[PDB]
């Protein structure tokens, strides 16, 4: 028999090394026949100005379509012949490319990843064919209402700054991104100190290091062009966006206050907090009995289809709030009950609510580390945010300290008389006025 | 809990039944209960043959009191034939309220 305490002393540690190019190399080994391997880069849309906001998403399209040594679809044939997968993603802060494979084609897989990020062609005949694929998936993106309403919340909460713009860019930039402006993006944001070579599954750290020395040595670990840009921070604003369209069947509303950044230690009590509000969907099984109060109310009166809370962190700032979907005659009661729950945690927060919210938070982070692909992305981006991978023992000793007085104190700091940012997508005539919204941020009794 | 003079508490339970006069309007004891929020949930959970039997017994008694009339002494509800049709359904509604209340004290 074991314990939850003992089993946290048995997760194998992340061995970090570093080449003379500055490239960090991290790993974890737990005896499996399959292994994930990728590169995590500190680039994104928050490192772009208004000339090339589309440029980071355009480069991710051309990454699997031809290299200097494997041209065209010869890269496709080689990944397919050994049973391997080849994924990617892109946000405002990060950019990844990775591979699932068997843990004996790791020498071939690492050579594939090193060739991708160094020697892409970006040829003129492929980017003109790639412009049409992006312009049409922008039109498919307008039909996803959750993607459009969360893009409204970033354009209104961070209005004057680079954290307002979106990953895909405006369609006028998608139409005009050159070949010259794509290679000058690679030189400035795909440098060796910004990349992290991570791996999980059955892998040796020592074998991964020599494979990194053999393949990643031609990178320049230098300050050419003398462009070390001063990271300037981004401020929050209370304001509103309302898009009225009565022909849509349901309405989407998202609201948030400013939150803490990545390294801030306030994030752990602010996730015990948002786990006390929670989430709901109309396909859930046990509504009207749920522990959450906003979820037990919205099931009994049929007020919404779904709601969710979020905590979106960055380097220096954050977003902290909620999103819900309802019909046109229910917006005003959903805003009344949600805002009265934020204020009941600034005061009045119980020691029983915090214990359940701490149990929910531990269960959420070990369930997210199941399989070699989510462990490999918790390795690759913890080394770009915290500078180290926080183990699962350091996470649990920070959850053990939080109590109701810390929760009451930290919620009053971020919520009690702040201006929120609000976004809405029609039919939204019953979305209340911003004066009546801002006045919902204070109590009446205490 | 008597066992020798239980002859005595049975005469007083019969006497109060006939001193009360809901049987003379042809009603059963569970018809005359005051509906608070627990009783309004127990009525909603009845099988439909029992619900329809109760709506007619009440309507016939509101009509008998509009004219100051009583049923003849052959249609009076007897003492040992009053079916407590609502008491099993109501003991479960109360027990589910006292469980959501002991859970809010935790």
């Amino acid at each position: 028999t074991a314990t939850y305490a003992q089993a946290l002393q048995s997760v194998p540690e992340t061995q970090v090394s570093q080449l003379d190019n500055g490239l960090r190399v991290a790993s974890e080994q737990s005896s499996q026949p399959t292994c994930t391997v990728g590169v995590w880069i500190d680039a994104g849309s928050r490192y772009e100005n208004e000339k090339n906001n589309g440029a980071g998403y355009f480069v991710e399209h051309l990454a699997f379509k031809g290299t200097k040594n494997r041209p065209g679809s010869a890269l496709e044939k080689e990944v397919e012949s050994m049973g391997a997968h080849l994924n990617a993603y892109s946000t405002r802060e990060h950019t990844a490319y990775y591979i699932k494979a068997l843990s004996k084609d790791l020498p071939k897989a690492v050579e594939l990843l090193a060739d991708i990020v160094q020697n892409c062609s970006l040829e003129d005949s492929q980017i003109e064919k790639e412009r049409d694929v992006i312009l049409q998936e922008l039109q498919e993106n307008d039909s996803s209402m959750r993607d459009v309403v969360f893009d409204y919340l970033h354009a209104t909460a961070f209005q004057g700054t680079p954290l307002a713009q979106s990953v895909e860019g405006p369609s006028e930039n998608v139409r005009k991104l050159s070949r010259a402006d794509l290679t000058e993006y690679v030189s400035q944001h795909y440098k060796a100190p910004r990349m992290v070579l991570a791996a999980a599954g059955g892998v040796e750290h020592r074998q991964l290091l020599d494979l990194a020395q053999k393949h990643f040595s031609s990178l320049s670990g230098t300050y050419v062009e003398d462009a070390v840009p001063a990271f300037t921070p981004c401020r929050f604003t209370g304001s509103e966006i309302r898009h009225r369209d009565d022909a849509l069947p349901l309405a989407h509303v998202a609201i948030a206050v400013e939150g803490p950044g990545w390294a801030n230690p306030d994030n752990v009590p602010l996730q015990v907090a948002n786990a006390i509000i929670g989430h709901y969907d109309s396909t859930y099984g046990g509504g009207t009995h749920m522990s959450s109060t906003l979820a037990s109310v919205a099931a009994t009166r049929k007020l919404c289809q779904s709601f969710q809370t979020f905590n979106i962190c960055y380097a220096e700032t954050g977003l902290l709030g909620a999103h819900f979907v309802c019909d046109n005659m229910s917006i005003d009661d959903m805003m009344f009950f949600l805002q009265g729950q934020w204020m009941r945690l600034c005061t009045s927060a119980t020691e029983s609510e915090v214990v359940r919210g701490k149990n929910i938070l531990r269960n959420a982070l070990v369930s997210h580390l199941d399989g070699t692909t989510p462990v490999c992305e918790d390795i690759g981006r913890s080394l770009l945010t915290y500078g180290r991978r926080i183990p699962l023992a350091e996470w649990e000793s920070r959850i053990a300290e939080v109590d109701a007085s810390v929760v009451r104190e930290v919620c009053s700091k971020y919520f009690y008389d702040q201006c929120p940012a609000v976004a809405g997508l029609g039919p939204i005539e019953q979305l209340p006025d911003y004066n009546r919204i801002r006045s919902g941020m204070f109590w009446l009794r205490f | 809990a008597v066992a020798a003079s239980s002859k005595w508490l049975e005469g007083i339970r019969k006497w109060y039944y006939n001193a009360a006069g809901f049987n003379k309007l042809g009603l059963m004891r569970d018809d005359t209960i005051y509906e608070d929020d627990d009783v309004k949930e127990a009525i909603r959970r009845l099988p439909e043959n029992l619900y329809n039997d109760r709506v007619f017994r009440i309507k016939r008694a509101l009509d008998l009191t509009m004219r100051q009339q009583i049923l003849p002494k052959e249609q009076w509800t007897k003492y040992e034939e009053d079916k407590f049709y609502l008491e099993p359904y109501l003991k479960e509604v109360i027990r589910e309220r006292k469980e959501r209340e002991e859970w809010a004290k935790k």
Binding site: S143, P249, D281, Y284 | -
Partner: protein
Amino acid sequence: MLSVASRSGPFAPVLSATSRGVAGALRPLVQAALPATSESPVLDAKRSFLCRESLSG
């Protein structure tokens, strides 16, 4: 012997208690978004959009 989900394309549907009900083993006919314009289904009974990607811990 092996499963439906290994070498076969039938369905599984799932119902939760605290998460959003789903239903598929083959369903996603991928490689149909590089040929353009297959649009996400408009909902009148809202369903998961990220299928609980929030609360990652």
